Subunit: 481 residues, 4 copies
């Protein structure tokens, strides 16, 4: 098996040469499936200088030119669909059905960005609000913030890249992207696509897998006006603390709960959505449903149906069409999950199903009554593990949903008008999912959270706002001859 | 001795040798006021003055428009009780309801004062394709120009405020035709406006008009907008004859309410149903005329509702504890009484009331009135509620829609899906959730579908109809 | 020359059968190039009944389904581009270069509508503005108005159809379209495209060229919730007067002026834009530059350059690639223009160039100092005629621009900040064109006018507003357990 | 005898045995006031009270938030002269400028009152693709929670109002650290707020703090937002140490102005340049520090500008005709004097002023100061204007941008393209057209690029940073 050689992108151009090689493994077989050049400190410096130099031409592009770039990306993603999905499954270990879903969502993200690029509206504001302000009016317009530092994760290596790259192009910001070293190929495929687009100025982008020795440049470099990070909370908060003067956007982890107070529209559909929330992407999602709170009257029926449905989930080769659950990103990630499951049961948790490790594979797991002191309850598991709880009081269930240091998304199943809006009002999250699990994300919704889950929002039009600066033209007696 | 009033022609109080209009006390029937009636020449002069004042109205600073509206707010607060007393006298509405109307008028003028300094425009990119390279636009809103206002007798202060406050907030001159039965509230606004120096001369006229000249408010080409609140047949005929001008119509209704639950409880549900069915004595375009109660709740609701209507105090509207005052006229009361008798003759079961005493109609509840009866198909505009039972929610929504009107509807439910199904399928401008359809917030978009009219009132929505869009398309502006 | 037989569209289906034929002539050769079935009174009744019956399924479509219809129209227009352009030139007489420009603009119109179909936003409003309103909030949402009556013109038979049809589909309104009898083929091509789109419910559309005896149904029929008309002012105002209860939108004629107070960026570019304004579409445009006001210091230079440039304009066969000016819609239209030119010169106007008729062809004409009483000055000429005037005072030039019973668009060439904004403030029009002639229209801009030019605005998002009804959900203590 | 003040802890006036801080009259240097200094325990208690008050703050009706802000407006109008006198005393700003600051503060609180009832959300379709069928969303904004506020000494009332008014308009509890040199303006707001019943207990604290405890306002994890106005090096260091919370920074500037024309005339242009160059004695973040005049206008502008500078009355700020008061301290004045001497030593030509008399600095104009001089390189925060000539407009814009600050810029032009070229290319938050960069409307988005900070103030923009977005994603809601 000869590993495929890829190029990295430095100031819009494919580079390889005698640079050191980064190995990319097939997450199922563990074989090196690809070799990618590793960027040097000088390459990163050159990338940042090129982004600064390309900022005026990026800012001078017509709205239709920014749109044409994004539409060309959409067309190339559709054309290379299966190839991109196969590469995604290979480097991330996610089942091929989920990989195809990610490519579809990436197409939607670039498509929303294409439409938004031609809709950056400004305001005409009256400023004569009092007599002392007579004859004043303003024009409020938004401008590109400038060069953007992007650091993306390994769990959605295409879609979570798209949620940074598509808004940057829609606005007219040059960028330097550091893809995750474990999954950089999805990002490099975008680089190949972007390289062939003539409308995009030279130096508008760089996509560089970087060593640990130079990774800090993406945090501290004063030439970037914005740092946008998606990944681990402790890493993210530390980057925000050391970023310097630049603006910071963070999309971090979660410990998403779901309340089941009714079956909506029925039990079968409720179970299917709970299975999706608890085990989609093998729990390797920042909005994975980690905690399930079921009302007393429904508890035995839900537990029975839920556990029976998790026992039917196909775990195996992610390249197979009928695989529901693929392996974890690494054997070390799987060992960590296994340790937390063992600890949860040692502390009093009742194992309902799964909990066993087979290399990088973790069986879909359900644990009942895990105490607050256990790591599986307190921290983001990021694995196919669901913590099942019973409740008698709705207000108390909402309070328990909030009993976490995370605040990304929450789910609620209810037929009750007041319970639905009480949950919207009191759940300490960025998004409340009504009659679906918290694992739901529309690529146009404001996505992000409170507490340790991060700062600001992604979702194309919201991510674009963070890449834009407000400027007002205050006009004194303009139109007076 | 009846009080003598002035009318307002080109911002100035006028009287002279004009024909006198009697304004009667709607309880005692005594002539309480004498009002000059405008001539054809006064209307012509009013329209010419509005056309002449349009440039100065359009040139006012946003803070000047605000100062006018804030001065109206301050004068309404200062003359509160006097205005409320005059309101009860000319409209017949109980003094508690009249005070409520003055409060809502203060809120309407206050919302307009805040909106006057918030007329935003857009900066739009216009380079949407290669052929449109180097193009950008500034979209700004401008006063439409002189506006013709025709107001009703049921809320002679607040339904005037909903036309006048947006016109001032935008910078439109106007000519107002108040209802001849209730012109005093409109005339008190004129008195206030007359004393405001910031408002250009000729910005307003308030003229009670004969029927031989009333058509000028419809057909005159100098008016850029006609805004009418009143009777549907009158309104639709005015729209047909308006000519080139834009037309805004706030017409009647036949508002239904679904009771599928008690929210939060039975007591509160009954109180809101009483308010909807009998507030302003049913003389409201959003009066709850039809009540649909689910079969499992029917007997309990009917019993509680009928017991509560039997406790309603009917009498002298000047008395603090009076709930139900008289109808606008004895003829209005006779008409309601005829429709009640016809409803019972066609199979309707009278649960309470139905009797007339001069201009007074007892609060009435009739069960199972057929679709052929006038009380069911047409707006009653009286203290009459039609009660019905249903077994299927979808069918109750379909029956709510079984009308040629479409103003507002009400729904009491604890069900998330029923609440949003009703929002989606009710053919109205406003769906009231866990209150009767008689609810209106002075900032909400208010108006309807079908025979209930066209467009919306509520200060910022009424302002939109008094504004014209203008775009400045800029080719390579900023290229040296 | 065998005329091509077309079908008409009745409740989404192509029909012909036992119907009478409408002749469609080549506006250059006068040959009958096409035969179109004429709809009977029963066909119109069936079309309206089908639109009423399709209204619930139109209103129940997902936003993405409305988008998919519009995107499929975009794809079919691109695929049949040259064929549509050739048909346009044939039935309208407009030069092939202008016909291609009209197909591109129609593609942009349907594309803007596709993007707008997924962006119909509502508001969440606080309603607790005072103590009496405690515990109130509202959700304001927009709903399809219902069946739409559409009456389109002959001067842009594809684009001015698109500006009614694309927003109706973007919103989810069924419609019955009456295309102009002289130019129905462009509308019938949209009908062919629409017929093949499975996402569009059966009966969502009808496209019927209608005889005079049944044309009134489009005005008075109570089953229509909105009438949208583009065409002749006297016809339009009379339809508004007799429409009954339905809402009315009107796009009528104009008598567009242009002020030349400077050369922006230079004389060459100014002359080229003034030529486009005065003679593009052969002046058969509602925003044709009919009146030209040039400052006295620039007058002789502008007149010389402008007259020299009109003398170079190629008039002839609209199928020729280098033809600038094609024939008028009819010989009667040309005779009418010729009469107004002769009347203008009889009343004191000085003919600078053109003014001669050759069948349906009118030479590009320029007349100096035409008095206010002449029809060429008072009314919309809708021909290749420009009325030239000199001015000394800018404020007076603006006042003279406004000295008309129309109010569609105006143009101003200026380097002066205050003159630019004074003109924006005081010109009594829907659109002020800055440093271009009034003949400029972007398919996304709010387009329409004041005075006799009509009521309301077209431009996709503005036309959509008129096809939408506001509904508020007033919520009392929702979220109180 | 110095006046004794109270500080505010969890909405309540406190004094006790706290260490006393002296507040001096900036003209006489006499101790005018004695202010308690908060302890570490007071700050802890203030933050705990703000966390405890956050649910009641978030549960207030929009009209209750409005009523608080309207009560502040009414109290500011009532105590106008007293507040203006206290402002001149503690800040040293001339009484005319102090009165203008109270006016601007009234406008800020008034804008906030109107904005408090206008926090709109969105109803969004979420069915953007087939996989998203049956999805819809409600996007609503929620208070971010407890706010840490750190205010400056240059506008101790208005720059406090720009943090406090949006916090109340939104429903955020807050802990304010006023500048220790000018706390009295902040303590008057506290006195006003203490008497407002609608405001929940613990909603606010106003605490003058020692350097030993000042870091709590930066690092404490109970605060959800840090909003700072002051010195750039201090601000950037606070952003670095803030932790997880959101950070808003309003820092200094080095504002330039281009004079390419006289708009509408020379007299008006000179008056605005004088206002820009010397209003608040240059002790403003938008003070016009650099003046670029086109070569054809240069001699005429220099002559008129220098002559007008020479007429400026410098003296006792309590006098009605004083234009220029003293600097905040003698040390501040000595620093400005050193930079003026350094500018002249490096080649700058002194056209007027440059002398120090205690805390007073004469209004100064220096021509051709090189880029290496501190007076050109850094924010002077004094009555000093750096005068330059240019021949090329594009080059003048480039030179305006030749700074590490980016708050505001000014441009005088009659040219449409120059106006919009400057709007496009000036690296600032606000471009002032036909006025100096010292212009600020209390409703405009105010803030900057580069070292001038992050985010925007101006009531509705400051409210945005105090709000968190929450979406309710609804799956098949309304399906029965």
């Amino acid at each position: 098996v000869t590993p495929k050689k890829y190029n990295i992108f430095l100031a819009s151009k494919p580079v390889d040469g005698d640079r050191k090689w980064l190995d990319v493994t097939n997450k199922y077989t563990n074989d090196v499936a690809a070799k990618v050049p590793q960027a040097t400190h000088k390459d990163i410096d050159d990338a940042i200088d090129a982004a600064v130099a390309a900022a005026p031409a990026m800012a001078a592009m017509g709205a239709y030119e920014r749109k044409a770039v994004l539409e060309k990306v959409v067309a190339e993603l559709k054309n290379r669909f299966e190839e991109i999905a196969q590469t995604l499954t290979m480097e991330s270990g996610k089942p091929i059905k989920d990989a195809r879903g990610e490519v579809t969502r990436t197409i939607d993200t670039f498509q929303v960005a294409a439409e938004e690029s031609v809709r950056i509206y400004g305001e005409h504001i009256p400023l004569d609000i009092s007599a002392r302000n007579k004859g004043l009016q303003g024009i409020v317009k938004k401008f590109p913030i400038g060069p953007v530092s992007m650091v993306s994760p390994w769990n959605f290596p295409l879609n979570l890249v798209a949620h940074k790259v598509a808004p940057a192009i829609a606005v007219g910001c040059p960028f330097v992207l550091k893809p995750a070293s474990r999954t950089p190929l999805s990002a490099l495929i975008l680089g190949e696509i972007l390289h062939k687009i003539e409308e995009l100025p030279l130096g508008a982008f760089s996509i560089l897998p970087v060593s640990r020795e130079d990774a800090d440049m993406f945090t501290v470099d004063e030439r970037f006006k914005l740092l946008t990070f998606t990944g681990s909370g402790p890493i993210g908060w530390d980057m925000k603390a050391r970023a310097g003067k630049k603006k910071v956007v963070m999309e971090l982890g979660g410990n998403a709960p779901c309340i089941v107070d009714d079956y909506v529209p029925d039990l079968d559909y409720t179970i299917q959505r709970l299975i999706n929330g608890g085990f989609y992407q093998g729990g390797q999602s920042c909005i994975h449903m980690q905690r399930l709170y079921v009302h007393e009257r429904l508890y035995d029926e839900v537990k029975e149906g839920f556990v029976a449905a998790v026992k039917k989930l196909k775990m195996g080769n992610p390249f197979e069409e009928d695989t529901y659950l693929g392996p974890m990103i690494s054997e070390s990630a799987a060992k960590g999950i296994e340790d937390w499951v063992k600890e949860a049961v040692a502390k009093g948790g009742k194992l309902l199903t799964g909990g066993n490790r087979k290399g990088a594979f973790i069986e879909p797991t359900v644990i009942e009554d895990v105490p607050i002191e256990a790591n599986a309850r307190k921290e983001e598991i990021f694995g196919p593990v669901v913590l099942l709880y019973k409740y008698s009081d709705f207000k108390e269930a909402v309070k328990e949903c909030n009993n976490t240091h995370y605040g990304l998304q929450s789910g609620i199943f209810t037929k009750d008008l007041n319970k639905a809006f009480y949950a919207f009002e009191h759940m300490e999250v960025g998004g409340v999912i009504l009659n679906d699990s918290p694992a739901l994300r529309v690529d146009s919704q404001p996505y992000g959270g409170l507490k340790d889950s991060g700062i600001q929002r992604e979702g194309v039009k919201y991510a674009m706002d963070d890449m834009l600066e407000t400027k007002v033209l205050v006009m004194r007696n303009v139109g007076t001859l």
